[PDB]
Design a protein around this ligand. Sequence first.
Ligand SMILES: *C/C(=C/c1ccc([N+](=O)[O-])cc1)C(=O)OC
Length: 138
Amino acid sequence: MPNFSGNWKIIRSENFEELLKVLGVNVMLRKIAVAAASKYAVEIKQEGDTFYIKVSTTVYTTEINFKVGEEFEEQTVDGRPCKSLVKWESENKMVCEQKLLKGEGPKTSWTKELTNDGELILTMTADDVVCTQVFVRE
Ligand SMILES: *C/C(=C/c1ccc([N+](=O)[O-])cc1)C(=O)OC
């Protein structure tokens, strides 16, 4: 039955560079990151409130495993390790708040949503900056 589960391919990416900028990434690396972001591919397996998510680009791949309501460890977009906790906001929207394991830095979070016309929308936030990325099913 249709939920977040599936193979998703990015179709749009808005404010990605500004987000990296807030996270301290210098301009040459941001431009390379933006170019890599146009091959983002996401594989999701969902069962009840347990998720497996694999995000990959051309040269890199990451997997996360979590259950809504339970703390897990992952990393911020710029690769600093964090403690994360996901909660539902509605039937097909979830929101994750992150806290840095070490150090200080911008407040980051992310949301994912299945829309009514079949898209997966990711938002990623750092302080005041919101990146939106839109995916469709492969
Ligand atoms: C689901 C998900 C997707 C994602 C897209 C892009 C990046 N990124 O490093 O640019 C990370 C993840 C996610 O949970 O990431 C927050």
